[PDB]
Amino acid sequence: LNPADVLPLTAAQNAIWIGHQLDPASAAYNVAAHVGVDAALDADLLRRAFDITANETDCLRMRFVETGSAVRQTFVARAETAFVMRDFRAEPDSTGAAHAWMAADVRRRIDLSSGCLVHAALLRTGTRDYVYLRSHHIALDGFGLAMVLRRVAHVYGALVAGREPAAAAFGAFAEVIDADRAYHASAACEADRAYWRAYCAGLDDVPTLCAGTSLPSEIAVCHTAPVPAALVERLHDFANECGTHWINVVVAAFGAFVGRATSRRDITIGVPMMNRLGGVAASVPCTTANVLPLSLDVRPGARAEALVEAVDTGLAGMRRHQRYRAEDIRRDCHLIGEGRRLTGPQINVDVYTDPIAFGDASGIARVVSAGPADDVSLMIQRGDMADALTIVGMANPALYRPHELARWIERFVAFTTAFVADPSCPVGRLDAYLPGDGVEVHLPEPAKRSLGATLVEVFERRVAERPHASAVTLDHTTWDYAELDARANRLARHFAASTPARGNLRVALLLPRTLDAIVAILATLKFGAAYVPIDPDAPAERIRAIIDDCDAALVVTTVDLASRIDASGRRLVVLDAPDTRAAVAAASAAPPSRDGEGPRADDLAYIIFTSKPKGVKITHRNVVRLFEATDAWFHYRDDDVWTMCHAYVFDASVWEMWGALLHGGRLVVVPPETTRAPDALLELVVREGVTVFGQIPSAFYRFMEAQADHPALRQALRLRYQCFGGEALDPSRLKPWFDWHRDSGTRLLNMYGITETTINATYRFIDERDVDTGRGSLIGEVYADLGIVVLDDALRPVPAGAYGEMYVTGAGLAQGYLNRPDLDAVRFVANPYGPAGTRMYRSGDVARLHPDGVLEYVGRADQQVKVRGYRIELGEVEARLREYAPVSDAVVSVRRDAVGDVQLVAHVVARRVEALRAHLRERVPAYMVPAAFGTLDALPMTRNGKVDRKALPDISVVEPPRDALDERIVELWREQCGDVAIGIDDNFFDVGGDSIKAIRVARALDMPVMALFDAPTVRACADYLRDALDRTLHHFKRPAQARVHMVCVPFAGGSALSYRELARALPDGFACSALQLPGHDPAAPDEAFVDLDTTIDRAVDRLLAEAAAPIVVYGHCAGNALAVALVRRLAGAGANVIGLAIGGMLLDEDADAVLDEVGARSGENIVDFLRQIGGFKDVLDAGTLAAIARMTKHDAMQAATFFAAETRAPARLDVPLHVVIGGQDPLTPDYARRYLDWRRYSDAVELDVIPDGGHYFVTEHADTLAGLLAARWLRQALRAFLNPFDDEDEVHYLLANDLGAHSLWPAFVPLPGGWRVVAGPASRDACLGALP
Ligand SMILES: *P(=O)(O)OCC(C)(C)[C@@H](O)C(=O)NCCC(=O)NCCS
Ligand SMILES: N[C@H](C(=O)O)[C@H](O)Cc1ccc([N+](=O)[O-])cc1
Ligand SMILES: [Cl-]
């Protein structure tokens, strides 16, 4: 008893239907294709064919209607055909007009209840006639269109010759529906289901070539690249070597290309599967297509032939299970929701290879739009000639500009060409990016300055010169250099009495911070030895272990601290012991150098330990090198006075020590008691007249808090420099500092370093400009004799603006780790960029390389965490919390929730909890918002002065509603989801929310449904309603980091939407709005035009409140009238208008005459002329063209009277004017001299030109325009860093240079110049097992 006349939708239909309702203004789900042929086709018989065939089908006889409260489809008495002929043979570019038409036609939405699914055409050009068909994706997919087109072709061919056409092979779509119902009740569905549930079990944050959230709801922007024959020939060769189709090689390359561009191992490619073979759908035009994940593991170590084989099998498994809807995979895996997705970029394995023959001439079937564009999609396509291939890029026009798309295709073709060169080559040797995309790196150059060889040579140099200059100060006591030198020389003779050992030795120091410790360092260095600091408060196990690890010849301590040392047999020197005190005083004060004994430059100086603990071996050369290479920018003065605020176990102390004593300055030992009390520190620094001052950023924040409460002192300062240490800066917190010392002359010096590169590797001067721009933590540029490269997980350089790990090549590299060669081998590694046997150092710190050459420090990758769905650096979040005014500093930790995965927790310190959340949700995404906070006096200081995250107090369901609005919504979600306790902040799709249930809600709330997908929390739902609620002014983007707000006035006949293509070609430095004149929406034409002064008046009111920045008004064609009238009426309103931009207009000599000319023409005449210069080319129906003609004359009459009224001596409005004319515009002739006629409105006018642009350049050339407008008036996501040197599963070489260093190296990377293989391919543990 099943009927024939009203049928349910298939599972494929039901999904297109939903997508069609999500943006009711969108044509995105239409489909279209054409067939070019060289022949003259009969127009009347061709529509007979379309109309015959359309009735031979079923899906094209359908109209759709809602019921069941689902959606049903009903047949129609007759198949409507919409057929048009258009002859472009009279335009100069006929072929480009035809493609222009087709691109416009496919952008007209279809009313599924209309019942009109067939819009066809015959488009005649000089070479080819194009047979064109569009429809809606619900009734046809790509392969269906081609079926219908082959049938039209057959019917046509018969009709010309008066033959009877052969019977249709088309089956009935009603038994496709039974089959679909059958399958979803079968076992195969529950098999296929669990195949994908497993296959996709891991998928999280699928990669894309651009970071994007919102679901694609718009037609693609295309680019078409021919493939060179040489490459086509090589794919078939490369394919036969691997035993597969050539099309699989291309999938493999494209998959490898995504991985190599994102530097990510987990790649998921969407593949449309035809899903027709094997069943009844083969013969029936319909939509069965399914876009499914292809997961590849793109290892930098993987050979090309291997990935091609992964594709071969992955697709094989896809084709087995392909009947299971990908939309249901996505619902099952909870990948529908906030920015979540199943498939990434797409490519097709189904190419239309069969020429379709209309009469005596064949053509190729080419597809204009198959669906909404998600990230990037490639479509393989053939040519009219045999063995010819072409790529068609298709992208989401919201995320990708047309030149950005062309670039990826250009990059890709070159990558493919390299990919098929050697099947045995690993992809990790291949670069996705082209040379133009890279940034020049600083190559190490020698430093032309010289001080000396060792530290003692250069220090002794300074005692000769100025022996009575002051050296060190502790509390009230001060010593000149000569006394300091003598005291050290005396203690260094005592060392030589107290051990027989000689050579480069190691002397452990357990000491308080006092002058004994300064003397003991110098003594150690004078004696030919290296100092090994230990903190007197260290745990006794660590003292024990350091001493044994360095095999101390001597241990130098005090009477009180000697009790912290075992009786192990080590020799001690106790400085404050009265007998030892005297034994040294009686010693000769002559230098050991006077006897010919001292360190060499390559001998060690100190060994500092990091966190088991690892010791770092530094040389005299390393340290003096630092200062030799920094004199250029830093300019060391002998009258500087430095500050030692940092423990001697931390290499800051080496910097702030030898900064004075190499150069002639006086060092101030700051007791640790006063360093942790920021007020007295400020007392002490001014009192003692300090110049150079080091601090760790978290400490400096506590320091300004003291500068606040004591203005007496802060204006008494005299600092040549203010320096920043081994954390990252958050310049946002520096606002109050420039409010004080902007004119003091004190610079701000930021220095990135790490203990393995000799204290510091980079410098930036922080000025008043870059505090509030917020470009991130900026570490500046590399020291002269160092170098830094930023590399991907394959050890290749990353392009401009991309994450990577920093590798420090240079001469500040430590000799290595103490007794850990295995660390020397995986940390200090062979250097491909540089001289033969040199080596590079893994920082493990993440960085971006910006195109100008500055480095942005992003964070240490060890500590990068992952919350639900997202990887986040804790340092970007700790910054977001310092923006909130009372927040001074903060720290974020992590903990494991209940019986759950992960959550964030923050500890903030005040200056002078729920208000923080509010400010935060307006700032950051919901995923960054810590779970719960805590109030703390200060932050746990670490032994070396950093934030101790291991001591933080541990501070251990979902949040309820707020106002009556919220609960009003919550019960509505239960209506759909049921009685499941939901939280205000919960996600709708995780709590049982269905894809359809979300339309029912956003209906009930009268809100766009895309809003809810992109943000499925009832908080965002409420906040959308109350915080938002006849719109005179249309906003495109109002970003937060916006300097300039561009308000745009449309041309004649245009709406505000004509600036959209500009608004998203404009950098995010700009905010862009357009004012919508009434009656100018061709969709709602039935309101009434208004005059100038009214529009201008109602546009200041909304615009004084809604302006996001200083305004720059843009005008085009007749909009320039309303533009100048705007800047003028703003200027008087007490508004921030800084300028005006004038497109496509020159002032007219006789304004009285244009006004008499315009009033004498019909709008229908004005528009027909604008259409011949290339306007309104996308308007294909007479009804809306009529509407536009009416607007056109209004806008023209209004502009003409305006410029007629105010004459040749206007009211001078006095701003700068940016005049932009297109060089092909017939309405701006003789522009070279005539632009100057705009001087009438102000003194400063400058011209820009777009030579190949015409009058409508604001649309066609928009990219070029934003380039101009930004010149004058003015990202991917965070990935996982998998370092190949740490990759257990790969194979490794162990290398050697001639001078005895060893390095681990991955097999897949080519060998560096000066390095030799000591151990054949093996595992990581094996290779490290082979070092002697
Ligand atoms: P809901 O879970 O159904 O999500 C809405 C959706 C728009 C994401 C979903 O309906 C969908 O993916 N529709 C697209 C259908 C489609 O594009 N078919 C073409 C396959 S070749
Ligand atoms: N190597 C250390 C680390 O590994 O974190 C720091 O980066 C070094 C440092 C340099 C300069 C200053 N300072 O204050 O001038 C403090 C700290
Ligand atoms: Cl290791």
Author numbering: 4 to 72, 77 to 618, 623 to 923, 929 to 972, 978 to 1050, 1059 to 1303, 1313 to 1370
Question: What are the paper's exact sentences on this?
Answer:
Obafluorin is an N-acyl-α-amino-β-lactone with broad spectrum antimicrobial activity. NRPSs contain multiple catalytic domains joined in one or more multidomain proteins that operate in an assembly line fashion to produce a peptide from standard and nonproteinogenic amino acids. The C domain is presumably responsible for amide bond formation while the TE domain catalyzes cyclization to the β-lactone and product release, enabling turnover of the ObiF catalytic cycle. To identify the structural features that govern NRPS-catalyzed obafluorin biosynthesis and to further establish the mechanism outlined previously, we present the X-ray crystal structure of holo-ObiF1 from B. diffusa.
To continue our studies of NRPS systems, we obtained an X-ray crystal structure (3.0 Å) of holo-ObiF1. The most striking difference of the ObiF1 structure and previous examples of NRPS modules is that the N-terminal portion of the terminal MLP domain is threaded through the interface formed between the A and C domains to associate with and activate the A domain. Salt-bridging interactions occur between Asp1324 (MLP domain) and Arg853 (A domain) and between Arg1317 (MLP domain) and Asp804 (A domain). Surprisingly, the C-terminal MLP binds to the upstream A domain of ObiF1 through the archetypical MLP-A domain interaction. This interaction motif comprises two MLP tryptophan residues (Trp1343 and Trp1353) that form a pocket around an A domain alanine (Ala841). The ObiF1 structure is unique as the C-terminal MLP domain serves to ‘anchor’ the TE domain to the core of the module. The ObiF1 A domain adopts the adenylate-forming conformation. The specificity-conferring residues of ObiF1 form the hydrophobic pocket for the p-NO2-phenyl group of the substrate and make no interactions with the polar or charged functional groups along the substrate backbone. We observed a hydrogen bonding network of the catalytic triad at residues Cys1146, His1284, and Asp1254.
